[PDB]
Structures are given as C-alpha cells and as structure tokens.
Amino acid sequence: ELEIVWKNIKAEARALADCEPMLASFYHATLLKHENLGSALSYMLANKLASPIMPAIAIREVVEEAYAADPEMIASAACDIQAVRTRDPAVDKYSTPLLYLKGFHALQAYRIGHWLWNKGRRALAIFLQNQVSVSFQVDIHPAAKIGRGIMLDHATGIVVGETAVIEDDVSILQSVTLGGTGKTSGDRHPKIREGVMIGAGAKILGNIEVGRGAKIGAGSVVLQPVPPHTTAAGVPARIVGKPGSDKPSMDMDQHFN
Amino acid sequence: ELEIVWKNIKAEARALADCEPMLASFYHATLLKHENLGSALSYMLANKLASPIMPAIAIREVVEEAYAADPEMIASAACDIQAVRTRDPAVDKYSTPLLYLKGFHALQAYRIGHWLWNKGRRALAIFLQNQVSVSFQVDIHPAAKIGRGIMLDHATGIVVGETAVIEDDVSILQSVTLGGTGKTSGDRHPKIREGVMIGAGAKILGNIEVGRGAKIGAGSVVLQPVPPHTTAAGVPARIVGKPGSDKPSMDMDQHFN
Amino acid sequence: ELEIVWKNIKAEARALADCEPMLASFYHATLLKHENLGSALSYMLANKLASPIMPAIAIREVVEEAYAADPEMIASAACDIQAVRTRDPAVDKYSTPLLYLKGFHALQAYRIGHWLWNKGRRALAIFLQNQVSVSFQVDIHPAAKIGRGIMLDHATGIVVGETAVIEDDVSILQSVTLGGTGKTSGDRHPKIREGVMIGAGAKILGNIEVGRGAKIGAGSVVLQPVPPHTTAAGVPARIVGKPGSDKPSMDMDQHFN
Amino acid sequence: ELEIVWKNIKAEARALADCEPMLASFYHATLLKHENLGSALSYMLANKLASPIMPAIAIREVVEEAYAADPEMIASAACDIQAVRTRDPAVDKYSTPLLYLKGFHALQAYRIGHWLWNKGRRALAIFLQNQVSVSFQVDIHPAAKIGRGIMLDHATGIVVGETAVIEDDVSILQSVTLGGTGKTSGDRHPKIREGVMIGAGAKILGNIEVGRGAKIGAGSVVLQPVPPHTTAAGVPARIVGKPGSDKPSMDMDQHFN
Amino acid sequence: ELEIVWKNIKAEARALADCEPMLASFYHATLLKHENLGSALSYMLANKLASPIMPAIAIREVVEEAYAADPEMIASAACDIQAVRTRDPAVDKYSTPLLYLKGFHALQAYRIGHWLWNKGRRALAIFLQNQVSVSFQVDIHPAAKIGRGIMLDHATGIVVGETAVIEDDVSILQSVTLGGTGKTSGDRHPKIREGVMIGAGAKILGNIEVGRGAKIGAGSVVLQPVPPHTTAAGVPARIVGKPGSDKPSMDMDQHFN
Amino acid sequence: ELEIVWKNIKAEARALADCEPMLASFYHATLLKHENLGSALSYMLANKLASPIMPAIAIREVVEEAYAADPEMIASAACDIQAVRTRDPAVDKYSTPLLYLKGFHALQAYRIGHWLWNKGRRALAIFLQNQVSVSFQVDIHPAAKIGRGIMLDHATGIVVGETAVIEDDVSILQSVTLGGTGKTSGDRHPKIREGVMIGAGAKILGNIEVGRGAKIGAGSVVLQPVPPHTTAAGVPARIVGKPGSDKPSMDMDQHFN
Q1: What is the CATH classification number for the domain harbouring B221?
Q2: Total number of domains in chain C
Q3: Binding of CoA 2: at which residues (chains A, B, C, D, E, F) (predicted)?
Q4: Which domain holds residue C34?
Q5: Is there a single domain that holds both residue D127 and residue D92?
C-alpha cells in the first residue's frame, strides 16, 4: 500500500524533527505538511527542478497534472522507496530516499519526462532530461521505458538511452550505462529484464537482452546478450557463473567469478 | 557553413516556441533574439556557468571578448554542432546541442579557457575549468589542445588533462579519461589523432599516441600506443581487431573483437 | 606547519589579485582577509554548503564549532592541500585546492559530516553527504573513516561507503568506488591502507583489505584482498606486479604489469 | 461578474503573447494557464510575496486557505481591477493591474494580511505588512479596514495606519498618508468614506472623518474633519469648494478652488 | 564629449579599484571591462532591473538592441551624467551616477522604454516601466517625452505620466509628480520647458505649461501654467518671484519668496 | 541597559515562536540563536544588505569590525529600539523594530556607512548608501551626523543629505527631506536639534537650524530657521505656535495651528 509507506514516512518525520532541530523546518516542509505521497513527491520535484525558466510553482503544476492523469507514477515511486530501503543497507527509513537520494529523485523526474514524451510534449521532456543530467548527474532519455521497484544507488554518471527498457525490480549502481551503438535511429539500447542487478561501472551497449534474474558484474562491458539467471563479467563480458538467487536485484551480492 | 547551421537553428526555434508555451520565452531568449551563432553561444555559456564567484552577465563579457578576438572558435562550435547532429541518433536538430547537451557546453567553455590560457590569463582559465567541472561534470584542462568536429556524448565524468591533444573529428563518450601519469610536468597525457572513437568509460593514460581512425572500446584501460586504424580493448587494452570504417568517430560502432 | 601553508597561500593570493584583477575581490574574500587557514576553510565550506535549509552563516557556525572541538580537522586539510600540490603536476599553488578543486572541497565537507555523525547528529551528516554528492559529485558516507594527506584528483563519481577506511597518504582518482556488497548492515566496504594509489574508475567492493603501499590499476574491479606492496589490475583484478615505489600514492605511476 | 473580468483577461493574454513573444511564457504562467481569477491572484501573490521564510508554495497555501474561507476577497480584487481600468486613463487592459501595478499588488497582499490579523495570526500579518512596504513601497497596517473598488495609482510612499478605514470606491494617489497622532493605542487614523478622491502627497492625520464624495487636494495636510461632498486643500487644509461630481473617485479631477 | 566622459570614468574606476578590495571586482565588471559608455550602460541597467520575470542577461540584450538602433540615447546619458556631476554637490565623479544613483538609472531605463514604445513594442515598455517603479521607486510612463541633461536627484517617489514633456536641462528632486488629471486619454500632464528646477515634493498636475527657466518650489501644488522665468510656490502655487538665474536647473537654488 | 533590551527581546521571541509556528524558524535565526544585540544586528544587516558583490558573510565581517571598533553603535541601536517602542503606538514589543521596520534597518545601515566614511572607506560607504536607498527607500548620506533615540516611522522616501545633523531623540516620518541647496560643496543641509518632531512629508532645506524641542508640521516646507520650542507649518513654513511638551519627538502630537 501507498498508505503504509506514507504513514511510515510521516511517523519517521515526526521523530526525526524532535531529535534534530536544525532540520525541523526541513522535515515539516518536505514531509509533515503534506497529506499524501503524491503531494510530497510534487513538492520535492518542484523544488529540485525549479529554474528561472520554470520556477517551483510552474513545475509543480506540471507534475500534479501528470500524477492526476497517471496516478500509477505515485505507486511506482512508493515501490522505488521500498526497493532502496530493503536493498540498501545504508538506508533504514522510508523517508530517506524521498528526502536525500539523487538516484531516487532523478528516477521520479524521469517519470514526469516519460509522461510528457508520451503526450507529445517532447521539447519539454528533453529540457528536463538534460536539466536532470546537470543537477543530479543522471542522464535518462525520456523515451526509455522504466518499471517500478528500481534502485539507482549513488547514481552519479548513470546513462540510460532512448530505446532502453528496464523492467521491475532492477538494481543499478553508479556509473552504469545502458547505451547505444551506431549513428542511426531505431532500437539500439539494452533490454534489462526483471530482477537484474548491475554493478558499478558496467557498460551495456546495443539492443541486447539482459535476461530475467541475470547479474552483471561491476565494470563489465556487455556487448552480447546475457541469458536469464546467469552472471556476466569482464571486458568484454562473458558468462562466468550463475547468481545465488532468483532476483539478484534483491540481494545486491557483488561477487562474481 | 556557419550561416546554414544558424538559419536551421532559428527555424527550429520558431517551431519549438510554437509547440511549448512553458518554453516559448526560453527559445526566444536563448536563440531567436540573437543575430548570429556567436551571440547565442556567449549567451548559453554565460547562463549555464553562473555562480556566486561570477554571475552570468560578467561571464558573458569574457566570452564575447574571446570570440571577437578569435572568431574561429565560433566556426569550431558549428563543426561540433554538426558532429553531434550527424553522429548522435538521439539528436535530430541543430539547436539541441546548443540548448541542452552538457558535453557540447563543456567543450565550448574549454575553448574560451584555452584562449585565455594561451593569452596568459591562466588564473581565470583555471577558475573556469573548475567551474565547468562542477556545473557540467566535465573536467578539461585549458592547456589541452582540442580540435573541431568533436562530440562529447552524455559527458558525465569526462576528464581531459593538461597535455592532452585531441585532433579533429573525434567522438568521446561519458566517463572517458585522457589521463596523466606521474607527478612531473611535461607531456604525460594521450594524443588522440583524427577520426578516433572512444567508448564509454575508457581510460587512456600517459603520453601515448592513439592513431588516426583507431577505436578504443568501452571500459578499456589503454597504457600503450594504439596504431592507426586498429581497435584496442580490455583492461589493460590490447589490439583486438580493425574498425569497420576509416573514421570510427563518424559511425559510432561500439562493437569490439 | 599550518603557518607555512597559510603564509604561502597568502602570498599567492596577493599575486593572483594582480594576475586577474577582475577576481581581486574573490581572492580577497576567500584568502586575503583571513588570518589563518581555519578561517579560510570555514569561509569556503560555509559558502559551498549554503542552502535554504542552512544558509552560509548557519553552516559557518557549525564548522567553527567543529574546528574548535577538533582543531586537527584544520591540520588534516593542510596535509590534504600539500598532497595535491606535491602529487598533482597540474597544481603548483597551495591556494588552488582551497579555491577550486571539488575533490578537496568534498573531502573537507566530509570531515564536518564525520564529526557530526560521531556526535550522534546523524540526520544532519546524511543531509550534507547527499548535498555534497549533488554539488561536487563525490558521495562519501559520513561514517567512513578517512585520514589526512588524501588527494581526490578530479573526483567526479567517487563513492565511499559507510564502513570504509582510508588511511593517511592515499591518492584516489575520478570514478573510484569503495563500495559495499549485500543488503545487510555490518562491515562491508574496503579498508585502504597507507600509501595506496587507486587509478581512475577502479571499483573495490566488500570488506577487503588493500594493503600498505599497494597500487590499484585504473579500471580494476577488486573483489579479493590486495597484499601490501603489490599491484592489482584487471576485471576482476589479479596481482600483476609490484609498485616501483614504497608509497605509490606519492608518485602517481599509473603503469601496470 | 468575475467571469467577465476573467474572460477579458484571458483574451488580452492571448493577444499579449503575440505582441511580445519574448514574454509569452510569462503571460502563460500569470494568466493563460488559470481557469479563474482566484487562481491567477494566488499565483501573483505567491510569487510576489515569496521569501526564504515563506517560499512561493507556502504563500500560495496561505492564500488559497484565505480565498476558500473568504471568497469575497477575490470579488474585491475584481472590483479593484475594474476601478483602475475605468479610472486610470493610462490603463486600458484588465490584465495590467494583475501583471504589473504595484499598488494593486500591495492592496491584494493587504487583504491576506487583514484576513490573517482577524484570525489572530497577528505576527504573520505584521511580517507581510513590512515585506510589502519594502517590495512595493506601500505600508498598510493589516488592522486597517479597506473596502473594494479601490485604486492606488502609482502608489509609492502610501502609508495607511492601524485604525484607518477606507470604504468602497476610493481613489488614492502616490505618497498619501492616512496617518496617526500621539503615542497611545486607540482610534487615531482617518475614516475615508465612499467616493473620496485623495490627490498625490496628501497627508490626513488623526481620527478624522473624510465624508462621502469629498475630494482631498494634492499636497493637502488635513487635520480636521472634511464634510461630505466638499473639497479640502492647503497646508493645513481648509474647505475651498465642492467637487464637480458626486463621487470624485470615479472622475479623478485634480482641480481645486 | 562622449569620449571625454568615458575616459574620466575609466580613470576613476582604476583609482577606486585600488582603494577598496571588497569592490575591486565590481569596478571591473561594471566599468573597466567595457569598451565604451554604451556597453557600461547596458550592463548597469541589465543588472539592476533583473527579476523573476526577466533575468539580467535577457534585459541586457534588449538594451543593446536599442542603443545600436538609436545611439543618441547614449549621448543623452552622457549629458545626464554631466548634469548630475555639475549640479549635485554630493557628486564629484562621472562614474558615480552610472554606478549608484537610482534616478540616473531610472532615467536611462525610461529611454529604452520610450524607444520600445515608439517602435510599437508597448507591452514590453509597460513591463519595464513598472519594474523600474518597484526596483528604483521611479514611475515614468514610456510615452513621456524627456530630453537630455536631466537630473533626477535622490528620486524616490518621482512620477511622470503618459503625456508629460520634459525639455533639456531640467532638474527634478525626490517625490516630484508630473501628474495627470481626469480619466480620459490625451494631453493631461505637464509640459516642462528648458532650464526649469523642481523642488522636492512638488506636484504639477494637468496639461499645463511650466515655462523656460521657471522654478517650482519644493512642496508646491501647481495647477495653473507658470510663465517663463518666474517662481511658483505654495499649495496651491502662485507666482511669488523671479529666479536668481536664467536657468535655475543649473544652480539648484531652493529658496523661494 | 542593552541587557534589559536584549533580555526583553529574547523573552518576546520565545513566546512569539510558540504562538506562531510559521515563523518559529524566522525567530530562531534572527533572535534566539544570538548571544547579544550586536550579533542580532550584524545578522540582520548581513542578510538585508547581501548582494552578489558582497554576500552575507562578507557584509557581516564588515559590520562586526565596525561594532568592535565602535561599540556605542550597538548602544545607539538599543536606544533607537526603545524610541520606536515608546513613541509608536503600533509597536508594543522590543523585537518588532529589529525584525520588521525598514526605517530602523536603514538607520543601523547608515551607522555602518558613517563609520566607514569616517575611516576613509568612502567608496564603500557610498555603495551602501545607494543600496539602502533602493532596498529600504531611505537615502542617508553617510557623512550625515545622526544621534541616537531616533525613530524613522514608515520611512519610505526619507532623504538626509551630506552635511545634515540629527541630534538625539528626534522623530521623523515618511517622505521627510533634510535637503540641500545650491550646486557647491559646503555646509548646506539642516541641523535638527534634540527633541524635534518632523511630520510626514516635511521638506527642510539649506543649512538652517531647527531648534531644540521644535515641531515641524506634516507637509511643511522649511526654508528659514525654526527657534527652539516652536512649531512651524505651511508652505513655506511660518511659526504658528508652540509645542505641548519639551520634547515633541516623545509625544508625536501631529496637530498644528
């Protein structure tokens, strides 16, 4: 439920404001004064994406329009929160991704851009993509199709291209590229299927499959498709083993042979 | 031709202003209100590099002076715009690099820094280098010697050191390092010859030649010179093949082996 | 001593004001108007960490409280300045790290966060960690234990997790991860011992030892402990040699094999 | 009705976007994107009253709460817009007061402060009073009781004290004081009745009546009550004549004697 | 001569930069870095009128276009600088009006508005009028016809309406209104002839002539035409004498009777 | 005592923060976190005078230098607070002038400028004078000699020239000019002696005495000296009576014959 995630967030916020007065005002503005997750999300995005061109209120109205049209984006955000809490041992609170984590922020900004792109507002979507690249150091093409329960841990240097697909329950670290090949339009970026874990620095290039439950080792350069439930590693990457679990995204085991 | 690129940009800007009310003023202020490419470039760099150290209107003065003194830098920018449009399939407009692409912005900021450096205004060039690093996440030393028709696609994490050379018609992806070795002054960075393509994450270290038309695979660590028209890949890199084209920078084929 | 580093900085500042008269007020504010390094450090951090939540004045109060409680933080910054000046051939002046180098800025910001974390002000430390990740593109968990004489050269994309240790006199390049494994709290990040050099893009994962005087080659993915005075490289990394020096962090030789 | 004022504003906004394409996004944000006057008023005040203490979003919440509790505040703004358009020959458009005229901005800000004062939120009302004095150069104590159909033309230097009353359909010029006497709390500011016109620079002091349809000449200092339908002028002011109209506020005839 | 005023300003700026370290960069950015008076004027106006509606770099473009189109506006500004230097004993430098005096800034902003108005860009001229009113506390309608060698000393509260005329070599103090009467279009504001001096707080209302070399006493309310070379004072004003000089604007003698 | 004024302020602040949570953070930053009046004053001035040229911390160091050199400026500020509380019936708290009232803010900014001027830092003093004119709409030449226990109520449009003297315990309203005559340097502005009250809009011009305990009526134009313990009013002003008390500044009785 969104509600237990949101109820958890407010209760955390109440406690955190008591034991850190420096941030009491911060917690009230970002969390306590909102009635639901949607409103906290739009507030976060409005403030983080504000520019002279589109100030806070202007951005917020765009975000609220998107969430009214497609409320599943809020549900997706809630799943992404739970992903980080459950998978990242440095995070023990529901509020932490929403408050602090630039990978989470960039992911929700992408959802807005994707909605815009699909509505034909492509100029605005590209503006926001490239704003997010500068501000959060994550460059996700708004045409990319990205599911829910996604963790982008640390996130600096992540690149996801136009024709990429990232299914639900995927975990991706800093400096990961889901990148293209060639100079022509068309399908040319990876398809990352459910349960995949991608370690820091991995470059996955071209219109290639990374099958369900696969594991891509840190620093891998993947140029050929990786079968489901297999571990790939190296430069260029080869099949080196099989993961310890069905969904390595859940366990974040970085070892490979 | 310069006038051709500029006319296209203005045409696009007129159509874009008509399609997105939130951005109509932006397309005017950044493009349509300007008489020539040089004016739009100075506007772009000023706005995007503004900080508490120096505001936008002050930056803009420095940039106009440089372009008045060496208008070839404007011709170089036009060649760079054409490189991105022709090589990056996610870009189908001439206005896109100018408005949005941080690698393009970084590359042009470098040109101003390089002009300052060569004039003997090194302290200002070093400020600008480091502002570009924070603002665009691209760290290019102003003493590097970089030609024209250069694409820096995505660009997050690019590092180009003091003594590097990059010839005309080179294409470089995110997280590429043209890096030094040792703790002494003098040539210690790579010399990248014309037509080279460098894939995401490649690290090229030392005063080593990368020959004309060579391809450096994504994630490679290159410690030895790479012969012309050869493909290097791996950690550390070895010669694994020959590229499919005479100038791999033009074709962006990321395959290796 | 501090007084020698500070006297050199003051002399450089006087020269710089004549080299670039435009920036004279900037050199005055950051350097000339202070009587000691501590004052100039607190000025830098106050401005670099200023936000709507904690403006420059509020941050400075925090920083001066920390520097009064633990003046060794100032001495640590002085050794960090000397490390860059001595090890990075692109940097000749003591003033350069303090004015411009985002790795240096982020490292001193971490010291404040670490001081806060150790006082139990954990929310505030996590806030600053994530602000520094956005602003300087360096993500250091405040519970990390980092010594002095540390160079973070270029620095974009550096990630240092919760249980990591970096001892004195270590040099680290851009896109280096000292990263975790697993979804469970507990000891799970690298221990980087004195004198170690880590090349650009290296990923070192898990609770593993990198021993005194070891060298980690650029682009390495290190999953097993590295013995003192050996060189590890490759994906995954293997022992390939021995460094030519007792403390490779001082010499910055990027060669491996 | 409101719907007629609002329909006119929307039509003007469409024309304005074609008259000055540069400002198209501004006209879109302030006017075109709203479905009613209340929404456009709350957008104007949110941005005009934004500060570090209460950002635009926080102000808008306050304003929408007030407009929901007392929608007559929106109707009052509509009569104020019509007053300027009908009485000021330099203003032809309904949109002009809402976009630009600082007297109109200050008058609507006062309504929010007055609403707050009457709810017992007195500190907040005094905060906004003094912010409006700095930003729009109009100092209105929130306990003042001000009706609707009020023009504050040019407006700089207007002062209206704690116990003042301004009834409906009053026109006031720049540098007008409705000021107190004495050091004691209690009723001590003017009562300006319906239809009164007050010329530039007039000072009206103490708990005195200015009667229905009276005219106060520019530069007058009024220390005694002014009868309905008479003209007062001079320093100190005396009755010098009768207005040529029943409600001089509508006709703006500045002649006296 | 234009070149003379400009050379003086640069000389002063060099000496000022040497005397005050906190402002050295300011004198550079506002004066010394510029090639001519027009460039410094555009810089001044851009910086001081910046707002959330239009930032400084955008304003600067509008201003340069106006000066390129009608360079007499720059000659007018030089005459205005000389008027203040020669007439205001608190000003002994040519740079002072340009750097600091809000009446001088307002007057030059009016010139740009007037150029726009006459070109048919009225919507932009009306924005700028009202921005100048908030920013400098001077409200001058852009359709007013104002000559050169004009001093607006102190300037707070000055109002000049739509149909006013102010000839060359006129001096006006704070809180002066050249104000209208009635609610109809057409001439309804004063016509101030050459050499007139207008003291602080004077209100001059209606389409009335104030003849060549006349003096209007401080605090006067002028409702009837004032003959050339005559002194008017009082509320309402009468002819009380003749000025001591042929052009009272030059001598600033505030005595009357 | 400063201490009972400061102790009163903190106690007020504590209570006000409890009964208005919107402003709790505001009260903590402006008042509660400071140890003395001097620190609260410097914080207020640093934030209100911050500009790109001289940000908050830079201004604060200038103010703290001034207060260390001449601590009587803090004592003067305390007297000015008590003046407003005791004389202005709209103010019932010690904290109100310090928090909100632009006349009080401008007066303390003047003290800094006066200190600067007397130290030879005249360029900076003139910069700040003209900043204050724009920001608070009060234009006080830093060479003016102004005592303590001064109330500037409402304050918009106040002008005080170079050679003016304002003794202790004077009360001055909005739109008051202590103004010059002529175009030559030298003593030429009023000398306002102890206990004088000046009503709104009064213009006092030339090097003329306004004797101890005199009263100047609102809207007066004073061109000849006013004897001690006399009331002057009119345009031009004549002696019309005697005040009701020895120090009309204390009683703020605005009546005159």
Answers
A1: 2.160.10.10
A2: 2
A3: 180-181, 200, 218
A4: 1-138
A5: yes
Tell me the nearest-neighbour CA distance from E5 into chain D, angstroms.
33
Task: Give, to the nearest 10 degrees, the angle between helix C56-69 and helix F56-69.
Answer: 70
Q: How far is CA C183 from CA A89, C160, C165, F78, in A?
A: 5, 16, 20, 59
Taking contacts as CB-CB distances below 8 angstroms, the residues of chain F near A25 are 24-25
Task: Give kind and range of the element (H or E) at residue A216.
Answer: strand A215-216
Q: Using CA atoms, how far apart are residues F49 and F62, in angstroms rounded to an integer? A: 11
The conformation of residue B168, written as its DSSP 8-state character, comes to S
Pairing of strands A191-192, A209-210: parallel
A232 close to A206: Cβ distance less than 8 angstroms: no
Reference B181, options B230, B226, B223, B243; nearest CA is B223
Q: Which experimental method was this entry solved with?
A: X-ray
The CATH number linked to A126 is 1.10.3130.10
Cis peptide before D71 (omega within 30 of 0): no
Return the closest-CA partner of residue C165 out of C185, C184, C183, C140. Answer: C140
Q: What one-letter code names the amino acid at A242?
A: K
Query: Cβ contact (<8 Å) for A56 and D55?
Result: yes
Q: How far is B130 from chain F (nearest CA, A)?
A: 20
Chains within contact range of chain A (3+ C-beta pairs < 8 Å): B, C, D, E, F
Q: Give yes or no: residues D171 and D186 share one domain.
A: yes
Binding site as annotated, residues of F: 174, 180-181, 183, 200, 218, 231
Name which of E10, E6, E252 is nearest E152 in CA terms.
E252
Residues C193 and C254 both lie in one domain:
yes
Name chain D contacts of B25, Cβ cutoff 8 Å.
22-26
What are B2's two structure tokens?
């310069």
Cα–Cα dist C123/C130, whole Å: 11
Same domain, E57 and E37: yes
Q: b/e for F106-143, b at 16 or more Cβ within 10 A?
A: bbbbbbbbbbbbeeebbbbbbbbbbbbbbbbbbbbbbb
Last residue of a domain, one of B113, B137, B161: B137
CB-based contacts of C83: which residues, under 8 Å, 6+ apart?
C149, C150, C151, C169, C171
Q: Determine whether the interchain pair C24/E21 forms a contact, defined as Cβ–Cβ distance below 8 Å.
A: yes
* Plot region of C225 (φ>0 → left; ψ -120 to 50 → alpha; else → beta): beta
Give residue B86's Cα distance to chain centre. Answer: 15
- Fill in the DSSP letter of residue B226: B
Pair F115, F192 in one domain: no
Tell me which of B88, B122, B137 is where a domain ends. Answer: B137
What's the one-letter identity of residue D203? Answer: K
Task: Say if residue B236 is preceded by a cis peptide, omega within 30 of 0.
Answer: yes
User: Tokens standing for E178?
Assistant: 């050249």
Whether residues C125 and C167 share a domain: the answer is: no
Helix (H, G, I), strand (E, B) or coil at F194: coil
> Is residue A192 within a helix (H) or strand (E), and if so which, with residue range?
strand A191-192
Q: Which of C47, C251, C255 sits opposite B52 (nearest CB)?
A: C47
Same domain, F134 and F160: no
Per-residue 3-state assignment (H helix, E strand, C coil) for chain E: CHHHHHHHHHHHHHHHHHHCCCCHHHHHHHHHCCCCHHHHHHHHHHHHHCCCCCCHHHHHHHHHHHHHHCCHHHHHHHHHHHHHHHHCCCCCCCHHHHHHCHHHHHHHHHHHHHHHHHHCCHHHHHHHHHHHHHHHCCEECCCCEECCCCEECCCCCCEECCCCEECCCCEECCCCEEECCCCCCCCCCCEECCCCEECCCCEEECCCEECCCCEECCCCEECCCECCCCEEECCCCEEEECCCCCCHHHHCCCCCC
- The CA–CA distances, whole Å, from D91 to D83, D84, E124 equal 10, 7, 14
Question: F174 by DSSP, 3-state: which?
Answer: coil
Find where tokens 């007008």 sit: D176
- Distant-in-sequence, close-in-space partners of C159: CB < 8 Å, separation ≥ 6: A154, A156, A174, A200, C139, C140, C176, C177, C178, C179
